Each structure stands twice: as C-alpha cells, then as structure tokens.
Design a protein around this ligand. Structure first.
Ligand SMILES: NC(=O)C1=CN([C@@H]2O[C@H](COP(=O)(O)OP(=O)(O)OC[C@H]3O[C@@H](n4cnc5c(N)ncnc54)[C@H](OP(=O)(O)O)[C@@H]3O)[C@@H](O)[C@H]2O)C=CC1
Ligand SMILES: Cc1ccc(Sc2cccc3nc(N)nc(N)c23)cc1
Length: 192
C-alpha cells in the first residue's frame, strides 16, 4: 500500500504524559480498553480490515494465547527482523514503510506502542493523526511511572469533538469518564 495516512493511538496521564511503569500500564480503565478495541477494529469499506503496528517488546508483553490481536492485521517491528509475511494476520518488518509495502485491502493504520515506537514514529511524516486519551487524577505524582511521551505538541492542533466523532464514525464517545480516581476524555490532534 503506498503512503497511507497513519494514526498513533495512546492513553496518557496528564500533566507529564506518563504511559507506563516497569513494562505495564499504571492503570486499568475498562471502558478505555473497549474504546481502543472498537476504534482499531471497525471499518467502513467492505472486504477491508485495519492494521495495528507495535514494537517487539509490546508484542512480547501480550500473553501468547492472546496474540495476534483479533480482527486486525498485526505488524511487529524489530531492527532484527526481515520483511516477511508470517500468516494472513502477522507481518514482521524492520521499518514502518517497508511493512506497508506488504499490505493490501487495509483501511486505516494505527501505531499502538510502546514508548520507543511512539517517540521515534511521531517524527515520521506518514503520521497524520493522534488519538490521545487524556487521563486526569487528583494526585498524579502518587502514580509511579518511568515512561513518558516526548511529543512535539506545539506542532499539532487539538480538534473539536465533532472532528473526533467523524473520525470514529459510530463509536459512542462519552465525556469525562470516571473509573476509580481517574477521569478521562478522548481527543484527536492533526498537524499544523
Ligand atoms: N499508555 C499506553 O497507551 C501504552 C503504553 N505502552 C507502554 O510502553 C512501554 C513499553 O515500551 P518499550 O519498552 O519502549 O517497547 P516497544 O513496544 O516500544 O518495543 C521497543 C522495541 O521495538 C523495536 N523498535 C523500536 N523502535 C524501532 C524502530 N524505530 N524501528 C524498528 N524497530 C523498532 C526494537 O525491537 P528490537 O529491539 O528487537 O530491535 C525495540 O527494542 C510499557 O510501559 C507499556 O505499558 C505500550 C502501549 C500503549
Ligand atoms: C501488552 C499491550 C499493551 C498495550 C497495548 S495497546 C493499548 C492497550 C490497552 C489500551 C490502550 N488504549 C489506547 N488508547 N491506546 C493503546 N495503544 C492501548 C497492547 C498490548
């Protein structure tokens, strides 16, 4: 597939934009996971699917029985991999662009993590949209975190919820979702 628009999808804790701790997410937000699954899976065209791209360490973090993520083409990057189609659901590649050359009948492409992937791919011009779930907590400093987004947000524009709605189509978008002490909202950002 030639030069598709790519989107990054991540959940981060404000104000620092922390996303992890010792290889895991520092929260369990059940509704947020459901939103991730829906946005990443749904398509509008007929015989198409979406593709999700992740770094080797994230792939490895999914229990073997639960990979590949169902109903989406999974792409796994590692600097040690050859560009290769494993099966109809799994591709190995050493670069985002090389992976995309092996795909057909894909509607949208999403980068799902982790931190190294995010922090490196944010500067790739193929990335056109960011879906950030912005998480808030009364005492963000009490949450232990070792991993953060280093995104140049001064070069991006947060769109109105109308644009996000249009992006996700049918998916229901609630406002100020609360789970335990966390409060969160979904946002869409595009480049200036
Ligand atoms: N909050 C959220 O929404 C999410 C958070 N996360 C969090 O992120 C953390 C994991 O991140 P991290 O450890 O950095 O792991 P990644 O999933 O980012 O894996 C990094 C690995 O990917 C490969 N890789 C990295 N960059 C490139 C590149 N530019 N080209 C090709 N291959 C590349 C390398 O494979 P090799 O070394 O084999 O070359 C590298 O070791 C955890 O804390 C996790 O919870 C993950 C997803 C979502
Ligand atoms: C192990 C593993 C860790 C993270 C992921 S990606 C992911 C998982 C759960 C919720 C997620 N929410 C958003 N908004 N973005 C992601 N990229 C998510 C996939 C596998």
């Amino acid at each position: 597939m030639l030069k598709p628009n790519v989107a990054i999808i991540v959940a981060a804790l404000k104000p620092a934009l922390g996303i992890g701790y010792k290889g895991k997410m520092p929260w369990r937000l059940r509704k947020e996971i459901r939103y991730f699954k829906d946005v990443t899976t749904r398509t509008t065209k007929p015989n198409t699917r979406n593709a999700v791209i992740m770094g080797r360490k994230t792939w490895e973090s999914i229990p073997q029985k639960f990979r590949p993520l169902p109903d989406r083409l999974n792409i796994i990057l590692s600097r040690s991999y050859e560009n290769e189609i494993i099966d109809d659901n799994i591709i190995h590649a050493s670069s985002i662009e090389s992976s995309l050359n092996l795909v057909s009948d894909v509607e949208r492409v999403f980068i799902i993590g982790g931190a190294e992937i995010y922090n490196e791919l944010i500067n790739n011009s193929l990335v056109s949209h960011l879906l950030i779930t912005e998480i808030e907590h009364p005492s963000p400093e009490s949450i232990e975190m070792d991993t953060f987004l280093k995104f140049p947000l001064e070069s991006w524009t947060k769109q109105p919820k109308s644009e996000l709605q249009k992006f996700v189509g049918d998916t229901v978008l609630e406002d100020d979702i609360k789970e335990g002490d966390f409060t969160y909202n979904y946002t869409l950002w595009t480049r200036k």
